[PDB]
């Protein structure tokens, strides 16, 4: 399994 | 072959409390997250909160914290949902949804009616 | 809190013609080249089945009429060739931040 979640804003800057 | 399969329709007064069962299959229940997503007449889809039952962390809509409490049990794989105080306005058809990493929810359950009025 | 607006609300198409529906975000969803918007199908009776994801990528089975565009705040769904299994209610869904919301729907209807 896995437990990540790839939310949009997680791939803006900055962090 | 994952299938999610909720507990029955339930009828509440206001001001009761309900509480909505998902049992899963197919697939490792500890390892995704399971979200509360009703749907009413008009009102769209509601996404209400979501737990990963494998540490038990949650997510909940604001519009909806301090009211609904979302827990897991991984030795029956199922999930719940227990909205409090429950009103008129929460008359709805609750399902429950695997969702996967990239946050699209993949498989669904059939439904809960839940009705609540005096 | 996203809200996403579908446009429009219903909508009657011929069987064999073209359906368009769209969703505004209230703000935008894009980065890095991605959207993320995602798109569902319901009919009565049956929870919503995932469609298209990241705005443009097609679910395994999902015939080629059905496509999807769009960036930033505005995408849209288009179905060619209408068949019957294709009127049903269709739901936009972000995934850009918590809370996820979805749109109202738009009820695609058989124009007769």
């Known amino acids: 399994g896995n437990k990540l979640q790839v939310l949009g804003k997680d791939l803006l800057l900055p962090q | 072959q994952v299938q999610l399969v909720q507990s029955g329709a339930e009828v509440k007064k206001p001001g009761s409390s309900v509480k909505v069962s998902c049992k899963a299959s197919?697939?490792?229940?500890?390892?995704?997250?399971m979200n509360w997503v009703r749907q009413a007449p008009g009102q769209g889809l509601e996404w209400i909160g979501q737990i990963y039952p494998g540490d038990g962390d949650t997510n909940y809509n604001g519009k909806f914290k301090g009211r609904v409490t979302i827990t897991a049990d991984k030795s029956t794989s199922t999930a719940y949902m227990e909205l409090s105080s429950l009103r008129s306005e929460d008359t709805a058809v609750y399902y429950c949804?695997?969702?996967?990493?990239?946050?699209?929810?993949?498989?669904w359950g059939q439904g809960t009616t839940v009705t609540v009025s005096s | 809190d996203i809200v996403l607006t579908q446009s429009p609300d219903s909508l009657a198409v011929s069987l064999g013609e073209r359906a368009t529906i769209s969703c505004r975000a209230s703000q935008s969803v894009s980065t890095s080249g991605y959207s993320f918007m995602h798109w569902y199908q319901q009919k009565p009776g049956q929870p919503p089945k995932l469609l298209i994801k990241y705005a443009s990528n097609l679910e395994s089975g999902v015939p080629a009429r059905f496509s999807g565009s769009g960036s930033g705040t505005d995408f849209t769904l288009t179905i060619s060739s209408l068949q019957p299994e294709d009127f049903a209610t269709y739901y936009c869904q972000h995934s850009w931040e918590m809370p996820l919301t979805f749109g109202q729907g738009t009820k695609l209807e058989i124009k007769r």
């Open positions: 949804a695997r969702s996967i990493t990239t946050v699209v929810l993949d498989y």
């Open positions: 197919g697939y490792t229940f500890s390892g995704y997250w």
